[PDB]
């Protein structure tokens, strides 16, 4: 009943307060930050620019890359007054963008679900990654991972007829043979930062304050490089998620 | 010796929601300490109880965080919210924003009204909740027969109105997916006219917010029909 | 009876860093005894604390294990190291050599200076550490406003200067992978001129070494961009 919104808050009632009624509440857990975000969701896909026997090289094709950034937020070959520089590794973008004329598909990669619904300012967690084959041919593929901020080491094949990506002390994966088609695994919160920005970082990324405003540095879970004969759908999963400082969700269009 | 195993028909299968973990490839990694942080929360449900704004449509059909009243008793209702998470005037409230990610709900909805007209203004309103079965009310008189409360203006600026959870089923679907369309209506009427003195703005604005009440819960996490902001 | 099993989607997959062991094919093999050995160590981190040489560039641009000073007070700084593992004058120190195999660091860097000029020579230096935010110092006067220490020549030949770990984040990236380029600078200035008597070499050389300080740590083992020695 009667109250005062001015003070920053109000009585949070149930039927029994103003009327001859009562609390109808039942136990229920499924609405918890952790449990809720703890399910798999696609953010993009990987397409090999080259064989399992050669030297790897950044490669784009119809918005598809042979390498991808592990973050919920939007990403893509770095943008430029003259167009996204496709000869390079993807980076975090500040907005979502149509692949072409019509809205879909998207040029950018990201967790659309998480974007349309991230009721919070900061978050953190571990990331469980799943890489599933889109094709039906006996697979021969190599996958390389690296933590946020690490050298891409996108150098030349040392050993002929073998995959350059496999040539590293970093965590790499080798998948090959009939029936062997999906890669699954989990990586640690590997960022230099204490917590990550769910949406926006109200500051410059460089000391000169001239560049990339709104994007926090190393605000991601590292990245993936692929090589071999198979393209794959890539999904992420929020492990032991934690969120802070509540904020507004993505706007929804009012009915005409 | 090796253990003999029976390999189940469902092998090699991947489950988006599999209740189990997978292989760790970068172990013993410390998670950058964040003990300094404040503002943390665990349950999406709480966000639901924070009252946020209802979008009220204008003739030229554009939205306001409120509605207006004056020195008259409009024969019809001032505003009318349809108790239904899917419902549109809520399209943009935290309550609805969270609710669209879940299949079912239970419990009370709380409608919050805040009078922003001048201190010198007075008057009374009749807020009501009408359950289905006899159709939506078309007159204060009818509304008055269902669940209602009188709101009196005065020193205290606001009013919390609770739409009771009255239903056949223990739960209710959160979305207009096919058509039983609703779970009744919340209607606001003038009981007595807004009254005041000369020198006072004749048209007062009443802020309209909505939120999940105390009893309230959501369940079964799902995906909404995908959308694109305007 | 056989145990029924659910075969996970990720089968047949190989993990370079898999936290587990594999099949043994030549068991019960004794490992040639080496109990006589000395010089053993367990932590790469220790190698990090052993001071090694900084490579100081010459006009014709070639490197020296040191820098020179004389009977003057150069208006500008004598040498300036950029607190940044990736940084080049350290390119060849054990500290950097180890650090490039790890993604992040934390703690103090220790800069070691050794005076090799003649016993008869004297003088004082001003070593300083400047954190970012206001740009790198361009004058002793400015440097003097940040973290600093005065180094006095005398009987004792050397000096250990600590670049404090002052930072927004609990950790810092070890590599210049994209561009925030640095974590401040270490600058060396003359406070007073090197002074001495007739019959003494007017230009004294100061050995410059660097190492990880006590507080210091590294983490997340990785691979550096591959290289080829000249």
């Amino acid at each position: 009943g009667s109250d005062n919104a001015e003070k920053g808050k109000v009585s949070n009632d149930d039927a029994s307060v103003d009327f001859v009624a009562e609390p109808v509440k039942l136990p229920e857990n499924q609405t918890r930050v952790a449990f809720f975000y703890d399910r798999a969701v696609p953010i993009g896909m990987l397409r090999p620019g080259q064989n399992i026997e050669s030297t790897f090289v950044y490669q784009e094709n119809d918005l598809r890359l042979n390498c991808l950034l592990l973050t919920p937020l939007p990403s893509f070959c770095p943008d430029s007054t003259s167009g996204p520089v496709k000869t390079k590794a993807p980076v975090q973008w500040r907005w979502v963008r149509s692949g072409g004329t019509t809205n879909f598909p998207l040029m950018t990669k990201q967790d659309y679900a998480f974007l349309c619904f991230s009721p919070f300012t900061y978050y953190k967690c571990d990331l469980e990654v799943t890489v599933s084959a889109l094709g039906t041919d006996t697979v021969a593929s190599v996958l390389r991972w690296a933590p946020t901020g690490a050298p891409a080491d996108v150098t030349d094949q040392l050993i002929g007829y073998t995959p350059s990506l496999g040539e590293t002390r970093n965590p790499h994966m080798w998948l090959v043979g009939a029936g062997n088609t999906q890669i699954s695994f989990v990586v640690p919160y590997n960022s230099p930062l204490s917590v990550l920005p769910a949406a926006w970082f109200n500051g410059w990324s460089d000391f000169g304050n001239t560049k990339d405003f709104g994007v926090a540095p190393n605000a991601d879970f590292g990245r993936l490089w692929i090589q071999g004969n198979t393209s794959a759908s890539v999904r992420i999963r929020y492990k032991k998620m934690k969120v802070f400082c509540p904020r507004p969700t993505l706007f929804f269009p009012w009915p005409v | 010796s090796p253990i003999a195993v029976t390999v189940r028909e469902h092998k090699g299968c991947f489950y988006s929601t599999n209740p189990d973990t997978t292989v760790p490839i970068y172990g013993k990694t410390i998670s950058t300490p964040n003990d300094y942080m404040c503002g943390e929360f665990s349950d999406l449900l709480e966000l639901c109880k924070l009252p946020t704004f209802l979008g009220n449509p204008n003739s030229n059909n554009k939205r306001y965080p409120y509605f207006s009243a004056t020195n008259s008793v409009p024969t019809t209702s001032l505003v009318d919210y349809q108790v239904a998470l899917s419902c549109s005037c809520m399209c943009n409230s935290m309550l609805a924003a969270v609710a669209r990610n879940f299949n079912q709900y239970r419990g009370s909805l709380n409608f919050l009204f805040v009078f922003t007209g001048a201190a010198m203004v007075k008057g009374k309103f009749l807020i009501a909740y009408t359950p289905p079965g006899a159709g939506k009310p078309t007159t204060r008189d009818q509304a008055m027969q269902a669940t209602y409360a009188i709101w009196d203006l005065g020193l205290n600026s606001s009013f919390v109105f609770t739409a009771p959870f009255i239903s056949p089923t223990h739960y209710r679907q959160t979305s207009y997916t096919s058509a039983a369309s609703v779970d009744g209506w919340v209607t606001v009427w003038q009981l007595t006219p807004l009254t005041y003195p000369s020198g006072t703005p004749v048209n007062s604005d009443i802020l309209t917010l909505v939120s999940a009440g105390d009893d309230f819960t959501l369940r079964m996490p799902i995906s909404p029909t995908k959308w694109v902001p305007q | 009876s056989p145990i029924a099993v659910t075969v996970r989607e990720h089968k047949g997959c190989f993990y370079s860093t898999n936290p587990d062991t594999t099949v043994p094919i030549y068991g019960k093999t004794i490992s040639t005894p080496n109990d006589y050995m000395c010089g053993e160590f367990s932590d790469l981190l220790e190698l990090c604390k052993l001071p090694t040489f900084l490579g100081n560039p010459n006009s014709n641009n070639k490197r020296y294990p040191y820098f020179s000073a004389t009977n003057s007070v150069p208006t500008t700084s004598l040498v300036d190291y950029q607190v940044a593992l990736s940084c080049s004058c350290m390119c060849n120190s054990m500290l950097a050599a180890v650090a490039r195999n790890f993604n992040q660091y934390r703690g103090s860097l220790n800069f070691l200076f050794v005076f090799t000029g003649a016993a008869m020579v004297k003088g004082k230096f001003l070593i300083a550490y400047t954190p970012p935010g206001a740009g790198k110092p361009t004058t002793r006067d400015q440097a003097m406003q940040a973290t600093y220490a005065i180094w006095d020549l005398g009987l004792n030949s050397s000096f250990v200067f600590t670049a404090p770990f002052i930072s927004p984040t609990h950790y810092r990236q070890t590599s210049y992978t994209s561009a925030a380029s640095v974590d401040g600078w270490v600058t060396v200035w003359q406070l007073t001129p090197l002074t001495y008597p007739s019959g003494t070499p007017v230009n004294s050389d100061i050995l410059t070494l660097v190492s990880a300080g006590d507080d210091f740590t590294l983490r997340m083992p990785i691979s550096p961009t591959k290289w080829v020695p000249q």
Partner: peptide, 25 residues
């Protein structure tokens, strides 16, 4: 009661393996 005859029959926790029974009143 039903058509299930396996001893090691747990692996997945009960509450995950089955809908949770709860009485309104």
């Amino acid at each position: 009661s039903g058509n299930e005859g396996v001893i090691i029959n747990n692996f997945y926790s009960n509450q995950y393996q089955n809908s949770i029974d709860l009485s309104a009143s």
